[PDB]
Each structure stands twice: as structure tokens, then as C-alpha cells.
Amino acid sequence: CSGLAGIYYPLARELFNASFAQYQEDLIQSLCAALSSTLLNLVEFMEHDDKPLPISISTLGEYAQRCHAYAKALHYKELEFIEEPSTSTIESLITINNQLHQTDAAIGILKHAQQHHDLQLKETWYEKLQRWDDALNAYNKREAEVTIGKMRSLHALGEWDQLSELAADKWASSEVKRAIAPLAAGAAWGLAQWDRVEQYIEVMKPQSPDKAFFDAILCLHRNNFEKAAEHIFSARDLLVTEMSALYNRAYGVVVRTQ
Amino acid sequence: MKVWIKFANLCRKSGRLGLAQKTLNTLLEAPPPVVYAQLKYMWATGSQKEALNHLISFTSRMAHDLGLQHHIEDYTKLLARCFLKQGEWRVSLQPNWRLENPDAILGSYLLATHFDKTWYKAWHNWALANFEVTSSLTQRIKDDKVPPTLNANDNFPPELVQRHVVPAIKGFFHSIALSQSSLQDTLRLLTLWFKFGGIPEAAQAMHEGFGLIKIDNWLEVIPQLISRIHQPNQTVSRSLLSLLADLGKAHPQALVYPLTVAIKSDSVSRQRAALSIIDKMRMHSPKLVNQAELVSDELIRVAVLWHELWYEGLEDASRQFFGEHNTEKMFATLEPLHEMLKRGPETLREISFQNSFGRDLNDAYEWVLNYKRTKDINNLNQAWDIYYNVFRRISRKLPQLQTLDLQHVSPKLSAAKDLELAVPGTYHAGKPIVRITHFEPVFTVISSKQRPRRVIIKGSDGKDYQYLLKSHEDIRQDNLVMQLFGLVNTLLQNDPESFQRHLNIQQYPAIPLSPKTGLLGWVPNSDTFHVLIREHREASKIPLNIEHRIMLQMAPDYDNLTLLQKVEVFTYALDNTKGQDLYKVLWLKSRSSESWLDRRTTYTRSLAVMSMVGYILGLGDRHPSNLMLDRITGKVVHIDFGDCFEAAILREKYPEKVPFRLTRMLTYAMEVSGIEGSFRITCENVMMVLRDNKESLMAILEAFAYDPLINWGFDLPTHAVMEQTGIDLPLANPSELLRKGVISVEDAAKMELQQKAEVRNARATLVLKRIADKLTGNDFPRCQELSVPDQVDKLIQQATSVENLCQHYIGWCS
Amino acid sequence: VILASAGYDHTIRFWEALTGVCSRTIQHADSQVNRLEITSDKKYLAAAGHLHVRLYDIRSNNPNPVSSFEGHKGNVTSIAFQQENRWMVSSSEDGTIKVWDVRSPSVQRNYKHNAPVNEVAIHPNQGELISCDQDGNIRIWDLGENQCTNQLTPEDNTPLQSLSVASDGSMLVAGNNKGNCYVWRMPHHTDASTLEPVTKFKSHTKYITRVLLSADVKNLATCSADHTARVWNIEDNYQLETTLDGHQRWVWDCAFSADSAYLVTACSDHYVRLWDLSTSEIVRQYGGHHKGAVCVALN
């Protein structure tokens, strides 16, 4: 007809082989078929095809792979970056493994890239800072935005005073919202001062899980259970959705939630 | 505090910034533990006598406090106090403790240890400090024995004693067993003891302690137990062998194997002792002893194809004769072949079937016996001729011999349908020990120089346990191998988030069989590197060797290839080639495509652990044959370990030394930039190794490699004894001392072997030396430690370089 | 001015003077030839591909059997026939230098090293010399006597490809795994020569192989298997002079014998293109080796 999908797909591949056995017809047909955009079903079918032997549409494969977003594509794209030395595609791969959170070794390959072929700048500093590295580096280079990133490292670092400098920047430039929010959060963490904190949270965001935490933190900073309760339930629900999306990643993260 | 203090110790383990930060923070806040904290921050600073100062300061502080809640606070603080004593003790011991100060040092240790009631699993290591005091003492006794220019060394160690000191740390070593080191320091102190001596102090003390400790403790190292066979001084060592059979009696059939093996091998006097222990076995639950005896003996029965073994062996024997005129010497081996002939057509349709040929040959052999025993010539002809014809016939049979079955060979094997204890090396201490469903009489004859026939024997659990013939191989060596590998995997279990990264070496069990023999098994579904590769690459529809191809293409031979010639050659070929096929096998194995990822990490870590393992232990076996991986989601199989020492150092053929072996783009394309982080991960691991147990357990396993005839066999072979062959060659005397000052050499004899074995101890000394270099550490023109970053780096270079590496002949399979 | 080269093709033939057309029967076969050397009178010419030195007469046209010299086991890395051409230096891959003198062809020498003996050398006094292996510091060795060492180490790591001494009487120079060649200034001695290091100078920084001073040593040359070679002017500060045009090749031979005008080369390309040492050229570009070569000689 019983209609069986998997039955078809492999069989469809056998047929695809028979076609592969001008098929310019097949060529364009399947091409546009890919262009159709269920999706991952036939996508994977194609993957199987390739696995037996190449169906081509190389960087097309790469593209549609990205389109899948499923991050298993990161393998296909790996093969892509496996082909040439594209520092761009390289970076893409870096962030890809970041998505994969296999990214430790990939960061190895990143430091390698800066070592092997030339080097990058932005994602370079960003990832090297994701690595324990880049810190004094981002410090000088910014001394030479990215400064907000170095500030994020300062948060990762100690020196809530350095964070107070970043806070001077916050007053200076106040996006400016998002920037200040995470930052001044870090500050209030370091700096027990409730006032700068007040400024912070005030400046934070309509949906602000961290500053929900801060909201309640302030309610607690003096008295009120109530607003704190609000923040509690609400942010609880937010993180609830978050985990609901989901270790193997989130264990630590959700653990942080709990 | 102790909360936030725990946060502080965390900070200590944690990187610098947080370390010093939280340090200062919490320091600012009986902060005796915080004393220890800031102290740790000082170790972070590294000020020697600042440390020592405040250390002794709080020491005397608490001394006054406790004289000689707040009470319990002081109990804990006491533990920490002694702890401190040891901590600073080691801290200075860095600079120190060769001879000298260590005495006092050790005292403090013991002092601290005396104060302990404790963390003293920590002070187990400090009881292992005291034991290492007994070591440095023994080393000082090794210093005295070296400069002595075994009652001599006995009295030497005595009279204080260092043995008196020793027995203390021995009982505390048992106490350490009680603490957890673990099996490592266990066996360590154990052999340390047996070798120490049997004297009255030692005798009584060890009697109590060993008596006071456990069995299953002693259960491990049982191979190393057997490694002691004939105790030169029966003494209390005799009684210790008694203790050996005693512990043995407990769950003997849980192993009992070593018994069987030692029985199989002829230890002579020690084989008589083996018969004694056999009696013990033939005593305790004697039935299982019998069944097992049957099992082992039946294995030994299977063995080689008998007449075939005799045939090939005699082929090499006549090779020996004809070449160089060995003759009678080789014919003495033929006499053993006659002894094999003297066994007659024993088995069923094997030697039985072999009768005719064998009978005829035997007649010819008898005909070869007669006139060669007359003087030479007639039967010197008849021998070579009959052996030639029989060589042809048996050559024909040998091809036909590819098939294997028990009933038509030694049906006695087939005769056993089931036996109580099978567990074919399963050997889980606690277990559901399995009986056997045995297997089909038909077996799989391996194809090799050994042609090491194999099967998988269905058990009571219905799980067929792959077994394999091993012709002239030390599974003991291998036993030790998986053992050290278990020390490894212990550290793995002992590991850090590396253990969250955890990858451990799967240890293929292999049963030893005979003095030269063994029982292997086919691993979990696997792909031999060379095999699998050759398959896929050929199934890639392309020349198996593009290597020998691009080679011969490049020039006539790599044999005469100079460093240059070989360099440019390897270069050009490399250019022509690439290893993406490997990565494409990954891609072939990739199914579900997350397999590509995961298994990439798998093989990555595989490579890592391998690297650590070898770089430690040598034994590269660059053969992609020797190389293997898993048909499962997979891990690398590095098996069949020849020995510690460099095959380079060994060789003879080719100069191959690298800590690892990496098919270039195989390794590379395996993940991203090849082993950038992967080998960096490896660096982390090997660093932990290089830290943790790098002293104690490392040296312990070293000692394992160190010592006697089976092990002395692997290590001899590590040279080999043939590479230990001739020289000037006295040490001083022995050349001119083999002169008319003889024949007493024939009357005395003995060493001989203590000379070679002294050299064994020498090579061992050098080995461990190379371990200390290896561990923590040094190598190359400079040393430092070089620690993680460097020792990893130079490792990586050693991996990177060179054609000199690639100069490995035919075994590199570049 | 007889001309020939030796390939991994295992067969060699003598190139004519300006023709470069190689005609002779010279068989490295059973092996390659490592170095290439004729006699002082160009009587016999000996080389070793593997483990045995083999002389085929330079004076006689394609004699197979000039001499056969057993020695320290390996392809002899380099060797020196003295002015005497009786006592003759030889260095082998064996790890220790054993010189085969021409005496019967009689060989007695022992010079130990920490690696394969890289080259057999001679000092301003032919009876004087030194030995620098693929290991490390040069070891001074005299003629049939008084030979132990004087250690000269250009580096603590890089393998020294050869011990290189031309006739100056003040000089030092070499080639190695470095690719940047460490050279020194020797004193005036038979052999004493306290070195006055010049520098490690990269012409081809990747594996500089053949290191040869010019005829007057006013120039200098470094050949590499990197297919990269750049001549220098040794007259002034070894100032880099002539990039040597070559295909992908291994040149263990870079020289100009009777010229210092036209530059003879060594190509793994199987055709050796000889340049003009003065500027550049292709001078009788060809080879006898079907596969390719690094080698050359002169007579």
C-alpha cells in the first residue's frame, strides 16, 4: 500500500540507484525536491544515498544540512570544512560544535586554526575566551562590545571592582540594556551593594530570568515574600519550559535552575 | 566555614584566580583548617620555610592546646596536624630525603602517623611513606649492597634494624590494606616483605598482619604470587607459601588457574612445591581440582597439531643442522622429536592418523638414528631425505590442516560435555561462576606462523567464550599487562572529570597455558587495523599497498634508502597518498551519524589511553596487524604486547621509536585538527598519571615488571637474551676466568644465570629510570619535569617526527 | 673533466665534458650510490648504496671491478681519498667512522660517534681531520694515528648531515637537518682550529642537504631535497647569491668543478639540469638515472 515509510526510503534508494544506474531528469528533480522544504525524512534518505555513494550537491548538501538545524548535520558540514580551509566555514564549524557542545576538542581545533592557518579575530577571541584563554588577551585587544565580552570574562573572573569599571561603562552607555543587565548582575553578585543592584534590575528586561532571580533577590534584600514569590513561580515556569525543551548538556544547567 | 572552607579547598583545586581570590576572602573570613588553607595558598606561593614555619607554629600551638566540641575540634585538628607534618615533610622531601634528613623526616611521618587514628588512608600512603623509608633504607641497603666492597645483607639491614623500621611500616601496610595504594601498595609492600626476609621479627609480624588482613586482598597479584615459586630460603617463606596455599584454599576454583599453569610448567624444585600446592588443591574441594586438572590438561592436549608441530619444528631443526652443521645438536632436538615419536600415535585420528607417515618417518628416523649414531653419513643422508619427503607430505597436510575438529583429533576434548567451573578466565571475584556448554569439536585453526587455532566455548551462561591457541607466548606477561592496565583503569576509576570523560582499557582476558603457550580469545566484535583497512581499501577498489607501490615506484628499495632518500621518498609518496579512507571507514561505521561523532571521540580517547599506555610501557607493536579497533561502536585494540623496552632498542630491524603510532591522516582526519585536543585530553590524562600514583603505583607496577623467571623471561626477551649476546666479554674476570681456573665452573655452575639476571636487574633499573624520566619527568636533551605541556609537546613531536620514525621497516605500514 | 652522476635507478653513466650525454657502464645496481668519488688520479671510483663500498675504475672505461671495500656497516655517508690516495678516509652509516684507505685498498680506522658517521673529512693538513656525525659535535681525527677528537657542536639537537671542510685552512661550514647552515671561522692550523662561528644561515631553510664552498670559496652553495637551493657569496658575509633552478628533486650534490661558471646540479627529476654558476643556465640538462638522482663527480 500497508504503507511503510522506511520500507520505501531504502527501496526508494534502490530505485535511486537504478536511476543512478542521463538522470538529468533525476538530477534536477531531486534537486528541487531538496529545495522543497518529512523534510528530515527524505533528507536522511539522501544521507543514506550518499553513504552508499555520492549524490553530489555538495555545499547544497551543506546548506540544506544547516537548514535541518538538527546539528547531526554538523557532521556533513564537518566533511565540508574537511574539504577546504575556509576560515569562515571553519568558524561556522566552531560554533557548530558549540551547538554540539562537543566543542572542547573543536576549541582545540580552533587554537589549532589560529596556529595552523592565519587566525580569526572575533569568534577567535570569543571562543578563546570560552577557552580559559583570551582573557588578558581580550583585555589588551579591547584596550587596543568585545569589551563587554572581556567584561563577561571579568565576571568569569573576580574583581567586582573591575566589574565596577564595567559599571562605569554601563552608566556611560545605557543592547545597552542587555549589556548592562548581565554585567550589573555580575556586579551585584560581587558587590553586595543593593543600590547599584537596584539600578541593574531596573535596567534589566521584561523577560529577565536572571533578573527575576534578582527581583526576588531584592524583595528578600529587605522584606517582601510576595514579589519574590511572583518571581519565584514565574521564573520557575520559564526554566520549566527551558528544561521542557531538553545529562549530557542540561544536567549542570537545570541543576543551576533547581 | 568548613562549608566555605570546602569552597576554599575547591578554589585550591580550582584555577589560580578563584584560588587566591577565595583564599584571601575566606582568610579574611580555631581556623586551624583555615590555617591549613592559607598554608595551601602558601604551597601555591611555594615559600618553603614560611610553610615550615607556620606549620610547626600551629603544630606547637595545638601541642600546647592539647598538651601531650573544642575537644572534637582538636581531634580533627590533630588529624590535620599530623597531616600537616606529612605535607610539609614531603614538601621538603622534594629537595631532600635521599639518605640523610629523611630519617628525621620519616620520624615526623611516623610521628604524624603515631598521632593519627586518622585520615590515615592518607597516612597509609604515609605508612607507605614509612614503607618508602624502609625503601630508601633498602635503597640505602641497596646502596650498601652495591657498595659491599643472604645473611650478609640480612645482618646489614639488621642491627638497627632497617628491618625493625620496616616491620613497623609492614604492619601499617597491612593497616593500609585495611585503609583502602590499594592492591598496588598491597602487592608492593607484599613482595617487598617476601624479599625483605624471613627473620623472626619479620616472621612474627607478617604472620600476624597477613593473618590479620584478608584473603581476596592477596587474591590479586596471585600471578605475582606465583612469580615467587621456589623460595631460596624456605624459612618462614616456606610457611608463607603455606599461607599462599592457605589463601588459595579460599575460593581456589575462583581462580586455581595459576596453580594449573605452574603445574604445567616445570619449575623443578618449585614444581615440586607446585605439586605440594596441588595436593592442597587436591585436598580442598579435590573434586573441582580434578575436573579442572582435566580441563587444563585437555587444553594442553589440544595444543599444536602434534605431528605437524613435530614436522615444522623438525624442519627448522634440519635447517639448523644443514646450515652451519648443527646436526647432533639439532638432532638432539630431533631426539625430542623422537621423544615426540616416543609418545606414539596417542590421540584419536591425529597422532593416530599420523601413525603411517609418522611410523614410516620413525623407521626412517630410526634408520636416521642408527647410522648417524654410527658416525655420521649414511643416516645423515637418510635423515635429511626422509625429513624432506615427510616435509613435503606434511606440507600438503598442513594446507589441509587448516580445518580443525576435536573428535577427529583429540576427541578426549569432546568427551567433556560439561564441567562445574568453566568461567573461561571470567574470574570475577564475586560472580555467578559459569560451567561450560563447551563447544563444537570443530575449531577454527588460525592462519599464521603460529596458526593459533581458536574457538568460542559455550558456557553455562550460554555465552561462548572465545579462546585461542597461543604457541610460545607469555600470557603471564600479558596477565601482567592487563593487570597494569587495571591499575590504569583503577586510576581511571580514581580519575577526575577525566572520569567524566572516562575511557578505560578493556582488558581481553587470556589464560596462560604452558611454559611457552597460552589461551587467548577473540575479542568483542572488532576490526584488526591492518585487516579491516586492507579490506576496505581493497573494497575501495584500489591497490592494497599503495605504500609498497609508491615505494617501488619511487625507487628500487627503501632498504638502502638514506635518511635523505627515505625522507624524500616518504614525502613524495605521502603527497601522492592520504588517509581519508580511515575517516571514511568511520563514515562507514558512522551509521546513525552520531556514531561518526561519538565513536570519533571513542577512537580519540582510544588513541589517548593507548598513547599513555605505551609511552609508559613501551611495547609499540607498530604493526597495523598489531593494531586493532572494534567492530562495535568501537575502541582501539592494542594487543599482543611484546615488552617494555624499545623495539628500537631491541632492534636489530629498523630504528622505530615513537611514544604513539599514528597513521597520519587516519589519526588526523579522525577528528578535526588531529588529536589537537584529543591528544591534549590525552595530555591531561597522562598528566594525572604523571602525578597520581606516578610515584607509588607506577613504581609498583615497575616492580611488577621487575623480578623473576617468567617476568625475567618477558624482560629477557625484551632485550632479548640474544640481544644480550656477546661482548668482550667478561665483566672483568669471566673471560680469563673461564680458563684453567676451571673446571670448577662445571663443579660450581650456578651463575651463569645470576650474572644475566643481574643484567636483568640492570636493564630493569634503566627501565624504571626511563620511567622516572617518563614520569613527571624527563627525556630529551633538556628535562625539567617538562610536566604536562612540554612532555605532551615533545611527545607530540615524537609523534610528528619523523621519517626516522617512518624508518620503521614494514611494521610502520605508513 | 670526466662527468657522471648516480641515481636510485642503480645505474650510472659518464656524461661527456660539455655534452652531458652520459656514456659509461656504472652499476650501483644491487644498490644506489650514496656519495660519488673518483680517485686523485681518477683511477678508481668508490661508493656504497648499502653496507659495502664498491669501486669501479675511473681510469678504465666501465670497469666493474676496481675495488671492493667492506666497512662499518651501512651506506657510507661520505668518504675522503687523501692527496696520497693511499691512506683514505671513509665514514659510514654504522654510527662509527671506519675509513677505508686505498692502501691495498686497505681499511683501518676507528672513529666512534653518537650517530651514523656523517662525513669523512680532512683539515688544512690532509693528514689532519675531524668527524661530525649525524648526532653532534665534530670529532678531530688524524691520519692512521693520534685520532680522538676535538668537540665542535654547532647545535645540541639538529643532526649534522656531514662534516664539511674544503681547503682554506681557516674556515668551518656544514649542512644539516637545520636548513640554516651553521658555519664557523677556524684558526690557522694543521688541525687545531678553534672555531669562530659565522652563523646558521638558511638559503633553503627546509632540510638543506648539500653544503659546498666555491672553488675559491668566494661563493657557497646549499642544495636541498625541498627542490629549493640558493647559492650564497661566501666572499662577503656568505651573501645569498644564486637561487638554483630545479624541479622537485633531491640534490646531495651541488658543485661546479672546472667552472664556478656553469653550475652542475643533482635532480631526483631523473634529468639533472646544470645551471650557470655565474648567473644561471641549463647546461646539458639530463640524467643517466631513469628514476632520478642525487650524486655527481669530476675527473
Added chain:
Amino acid sequence: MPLIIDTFQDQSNSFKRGAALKALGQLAASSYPELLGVLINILSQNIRRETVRLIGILGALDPYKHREVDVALLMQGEEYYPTVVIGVLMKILKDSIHHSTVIQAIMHIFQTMFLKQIIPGFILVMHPPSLLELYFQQLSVLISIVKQHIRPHVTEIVDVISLTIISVIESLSRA
């Protein structure tokens, strides 16, 4: 909430880990901020691992291989590929609409006109009267080849039930 005050009196870990995981899954599954407040009240490495062990006890083997599956064949795997197809079809077949499998096997042998057949021996053995008819004909198809090992099973099915008289007659014919 009970678990909450329990926590007030204790820490959990233990077997609850697995449960919690299920619960987590359940929380994920049943997510009303019921489950919200719940996991909120739930209140990692080691535990993770041990949980992977317990779940390894909870599920294993076939589903993995099923996810590894056919595609599996080709992985391990022309002639072969086609045969593998056959096997796949058969796999689903045994894996219901009976007559489907009937015609399946029919054209299966027809096309065969093997190993898989042996497996399919057992398949047919799995077994209304239509079954009997079709399968009888199928045996007649099997009359092409020679058991070997189909024989005993053949006898087995032949027993129950002993119409099919002609079928078995043909079995002996094929004997």
C-alpha cells in the same frame, strides 16, 4: 511536596535517581504548572552515570539495533543489496496483515526462483485456513530448494494440524 518536606528531613539520591529521571521524563512528559512546581521542588555526573546504568537495565539491545537497522544491512553490505532488500521486506513481514505476508512470500520465492529463506522458514512457522492454504502453496514453492534444516521445523508445523494432505504429500515429494 511530600518529597519536599522529605528533603527537609533528608537527601535522596539512591534508586530514586532513576525514578527522578523517569520523573524528570514524566515531568517533561506530563508538563498546568503542576510538573513545573514539582521539578521546581526536585531540589550530577556520578548520578547521571548510575542513572544511565539503571536505564541500561530499563532498555537496551534491539531498539538501538533497530535504530541501527536494513540500513544495517547495507552498512554491513548489488546481488547482496537486492537480497538484503528481500530480507528487509521479510523483516517487516514477520513484523498484522497476514495475506500481505502471504503474497509477500509468494513473490519472494518467485523472485528467489537462501539464508533468509531459512529465517522465513521460521517466519512461515509463526503461522484462518487461508493461512494453511497459502503456506501450503508456499511449501510447494520451497520445493525448489533442499533442506537441510527446514526439515525438522517442517515436520513440526506438519504435526499441527494433520486438506493439507496434498501439501504434505508435496513435502514428501520434495523430500
